[PDB]
Amino acid sequence: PTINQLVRKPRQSKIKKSTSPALNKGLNSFKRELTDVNSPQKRGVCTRVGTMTPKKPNSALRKYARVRLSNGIEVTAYIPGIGHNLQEHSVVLIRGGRVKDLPGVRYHIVRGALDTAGVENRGQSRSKYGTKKP
Amino acid sequence: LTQERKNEIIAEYRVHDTDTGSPEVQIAVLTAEINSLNEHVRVHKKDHHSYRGLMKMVGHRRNLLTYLRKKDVQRYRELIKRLGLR
RNA sequence: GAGGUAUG
RNA sequence: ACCCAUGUCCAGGAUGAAGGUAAGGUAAUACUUACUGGAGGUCCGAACCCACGCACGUUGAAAAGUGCGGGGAUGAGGUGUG
RNA sequence: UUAAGGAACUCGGCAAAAUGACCCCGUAACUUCGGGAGAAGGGGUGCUCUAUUAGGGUGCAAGCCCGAGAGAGCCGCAGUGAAUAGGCCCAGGCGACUGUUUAGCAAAAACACAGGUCUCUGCAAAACCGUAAGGUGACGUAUAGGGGCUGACGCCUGCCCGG
RNA sequence: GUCCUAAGGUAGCGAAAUUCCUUGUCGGGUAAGUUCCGACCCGCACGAAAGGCGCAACGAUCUGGGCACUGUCUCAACGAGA
RNA sequence: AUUAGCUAGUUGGUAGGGUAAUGGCCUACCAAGGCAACGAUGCAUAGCCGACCUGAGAGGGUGAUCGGCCACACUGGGACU
RNA sequence: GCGUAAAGCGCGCGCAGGCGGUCUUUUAAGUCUGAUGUGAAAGCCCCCGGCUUAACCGGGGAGGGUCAUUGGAAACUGGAAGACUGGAGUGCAGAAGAGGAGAGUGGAAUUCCACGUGUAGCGGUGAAAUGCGUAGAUAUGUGGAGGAACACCAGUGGCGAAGGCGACUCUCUGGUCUGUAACUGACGCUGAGGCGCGAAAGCGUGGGGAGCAAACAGGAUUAGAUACCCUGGUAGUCCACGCCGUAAACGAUGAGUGCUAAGUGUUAGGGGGUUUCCGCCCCUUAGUGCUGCAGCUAACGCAUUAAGCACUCCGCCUGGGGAG
RNA sequence: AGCCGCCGAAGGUGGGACAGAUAAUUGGGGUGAAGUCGUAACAAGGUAGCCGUAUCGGAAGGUGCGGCUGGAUCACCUCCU
Ligand SMILES: [K+]
Ligand SMILES: [K+]
Ligand SMILES: [K+]
Ligand SMILES: [K+]
Ligand SMILES: [Mg+2]
Ligand SMILES: [Mg+2]
Ligand SMILES: [Mg+2]
Ligand SMILES: [Mg+2]
Ligand SMILES: [Mg+2]
Ligand SMILES: [Mg+2]
Ligand SMILES: [Mg+2]
Ligand SMILES: [Mg+2]
Ligand SMILES: [Mg+2]
Ligand SMILES: [Mg+2]
Ligand SMILES: [Mg+2]
Ligand SMILES: [Mg+2]
Ligand SMILES: [Mg+2]
Ligand SMILES: [Mg+2]
Ligand SMILES: [Mg+2]
Ligand SMILES: [Mg+2]
Ligand SMILES: [Mg+2]
Ligand SMILES: [Mg+2]
Ligand SMILES: [Mg+2]
Ligand SMILES: [Mg+2]
Ligand SMILES: [Mg+2]
Ligand SMILES: [Mg+2]
Ligand SMILES: [Mg+2]
Ligand SMILES: [Mg+2]
Ligand SMILES: [Mg+2]
Ligand SMILES: [Mg+2]
Ligand SMILES: [Mg+2]
Ligand SMILES: [Mg+2]
Ligand SMILES: [Mg+2]
């Protein structure tokens, strides 16, 4: 462009989207108005639990839970690891992370933080999946 | 616009006896031409190709007129009442 | 070399 | 009831169409603002005409009215004479 | 005229009450850009002095009428002090409208309306009245006249000709 | 796919001035709503000049709700006149 | 600018009063200016800076802790001392 | 960065702004420069020291401002006063042109009407059939009516900002190029926001409507055929006026200026050598096309009509889709 | 002291504007190992494709009007190497 063009309008960079929009919103009951606050993790209440058929190429059933977070946003969270404790009205803690197999999931459930009891029988990567040392 | 009439209207407003390329002369001849073309358009309203050249004459006239205004303002305030502008 | 005139 | 010819009636106020003039504006038109103008099965509202509601009357003051409100009221108007 | 309440009445707010006049501020959705609109919602109105008033009208002038704001005050519950003089808003169906109608139970969503469309008619038109003459039509002439249907405006009006 | 047809209802609208069942269902409004508004569509039995759908202004039109106002009422009392 | 007009003590002036002090700070009278596409007006956002993190640097993001300044003490207004 | 990948408004007229030919003087708005003052401490940076080193802490210095005042330079930008002409324009002499609007006009040729001659087919297809035809066609001749478009010329030829413009004549008009150096003397380039124009389709009102023809009907086709195909055929197409303002609106290539090898056609001009004009040759201007050197490009390819080398201005792009 | 006046926060009333949440219902969008009807495009994609527009149609899409080549095979014409 010409310099006069660049002065009449300077540049404008790209509008960045977050991987994790719902972690980046807080709530106050008083105002009843969402408040932008960068957050790593949120807790919620499992509305629904179920299985998913993932994309091509894959075919295994994937465990998800539809959660209502603390801030009121309804979110689908993958339940990683072998087996789980969860059911309806179960409280859950939620971190970000995208299940590439599965279309509508963008977040994971931290395993071992709350009523998400740790995985059974696991020995390796225990800090993930939330088993104590035996 | 005929040659004889053109010669008349250049020689009767020429600043001096040699001159036929002054802004006085050009602005005058343009006012003749644009008035004849205003008549032409009021008759043949949809000859937009003619209306193009009309607006080019008007633009050139305004250009000369601004230059004259910047150059000597007395020439300007003379010509406007001598010709019928504004 | 160019221009124109049924399914998997 | 409809019509024919001929007459006559409609207090007062309001709104402000077209058009026109002028200033601005233009290359010239547009166009804007003001003023003027006086249009309308226009508005408000008496007379005039009608008859929406209610009440009273209902061997009525009256064989269809009275009272309180109501609609139109320059028009597809009302009315007179023949 | 009525305590308190205020549509609980009732087929139904029937009736009644309330609003009401001049000026000023301000005024929505929608709109066929004209309207809606007096929308709504609110304020002020009396008398006295400044006042033969600022200013206007008239007149040869004297004089005679209209009376603009403002201040400064006065009195009352209340100042268009009486009488006369819109209740408003939201939503919807129907009919566009003004108008007409069952004199004497129905005023309407019915009739008409402008507009659309079909159809007929060549002029001694067609259609109508009448036995006929004679007339209307029309002292007109298919951009006119008669009949049928529809019923402003906007977007549209589909298929079927066997009967 | 097949019968019948002259051809089988288009748009638009739709428990409708039309919807029986039917106080249909859902939503709204109300403490409570067979009425009301908006949507749905199994349109008993809408539908395109017996016009369809829509629509500003208009209306003594019909309908539902609200503010104000009130002897309509709770529940009647007084006064005046005929 | 998917916000273009805004302002009416608003702009200037003559007088007057007021503050510790200049000034429409306020009052009265006169004129009708003034600002604005060099983005006024309006909406949303935000305390500002030193500085912090990053980056070859230009620059990008932040304004915890430390220091400076500003603002506010349940919300609003007002004065006294 | 925008030919083909995303990206040049469809094109113009032009207010504002940005940018601006050569020379002299004047200034010092911008620029450059010496001095003074300040830009706190802490923090970054450098140099020392201290905590068993480190982290940390201390001392000192440095840096940092489109900072301000004051004093100097005039090269460039800007302001001012003059002068000049290669830009820009007027004049003068010529040349081309389907540039546009209006009015009128011509004959081919499709259809239709009438009349003769005239007898059983015509039409169409891959085959057909629907359809027209003994109430007489098809064709053939004559005459008449109606409208729409304009063969040859006609050509990568002309003009136009683009859309686009082809039969002829007249009127009214626009723009272009060539030559001159007469005249003015930078008057200019672009151009947001505005204003207008703007294929075909389409919309409103009123005409016209011959052909072609969406829709639609019938006949075939097909598994089916809401299509290709046939026969018919309404809107439209045409005109006047006014809206609509889109396009594979495309050279998919913004306007302007200058510079950087050639070869060759073609158009409109000019200049000169030769020759009886004619004719050939060369030089040059503005266009339009072909092929190619450098150079650029991812390549294809562009190549004095750059997609090269540079400057000014505008518009636009920032992964696909959603989503125009 | 009291009283009267000016300014004056909150409050009340009123109608508009602005921003958001929600809503019977509705619209299209997208995603989703193996469902459905057809085959519109890619080659001449079997009617050449595509742009705009109108209309029609279960759906892709078709037809008309104009426009482009981002058009395959065959032809004469211009032009070049
Ligand atoms: K229903
Ligand atoms: K002030
Ligand atoms: K038409
Ligand atoms: K083209
Ligand atoms: Mg296949
Ligand atoms: Mg009237
Ligand atoms: Mg009335
Ligand atoms: Mg009465
Ligand atoms: Mg009246
Ligand atoms: Mg009488
Ligand atoms: Mg009589
Ligand atoms: Mg009472
Ligand atoms: Mg009481
Ligand atoms: Mg009740
Ligand atoms: Mg009861
Ligand atoms: Mg009543
Ligand atoms: Mg009526
Ligand atoms: Mg009666
Ligand atoms: Mg009655
Ligand atoms: Mg009629
Ligand atoms: Mg007779
Ligand atoms: Mg009727
Ligand atoms: Mg009822
Ligand atoms: Mg019909
Ligand atoms: Mg009436
Ligand atoms: Mg804040
Ligand atoms: Mg970098
Ligand atoms: Mg592209
Ligand atoms: Mg420091
Ligand atoms: Mg057209
Ligand atoms: Mg195909
Ligand atoms: Mg194909
Ligand atoms: Mg078709």
UniProtKB/Swiss-Prot annotation, chain A:
The keyword Zinc does not apply. This is Small ribosomal subunit protein uS12. Residues 8-17 have a biased composition (Basic residues). Part of the 30S ribosomal subunit. Contacts proteins S8 and S17. May interact with IF1 in the 30S initiation complex. Residues 1-25 are annotated as: Disordered. GO terms for cellular component: ribosome; small ribosomal subunit. Transmembrane segments: none annotated. The lineage of its organism: Bacteria, Bacillati, Bacillota, Bacilli, Bacillales. It comes from Listeria monocytogenes serovar 1/2a (strain ATCC BAA-679 / EGD-e).
From Swiss-Prot, chain B:
Part of the 30S ribosomal subunit. Forms a bridge to the 50S subunit in the 70S ribosome, contacting the 23S rRNA. GO terms for cellular component: cytosolic small ribosomal subunit. Keywords: Ribonucleoprotein, Ribosomal protein, RNA-binding, rRNA-binding. GO terms for biological process: translation. SUPFAM superfamilies: S15/NS1 RNA-binding domain. This is Small ribosomal subunit protein uS15. One of the primary rRNA binding proteins, it binds directly to 16S rRNA where it helps nucleate assembly of the platform of the 30S subunit by binding and bridging several RNA helices of the 16S rRNA. SMART domains: Ribosomal_S15 (SM01387). It comes from Listeria monocytogenes serovar 1/2a (strain ATCC BAA-679 / EGD-e). It comes from the Bacteria. GO terms for molecular function: rRNA binding; structural constituent of ribosome. The keyword rRNA-binding applies.
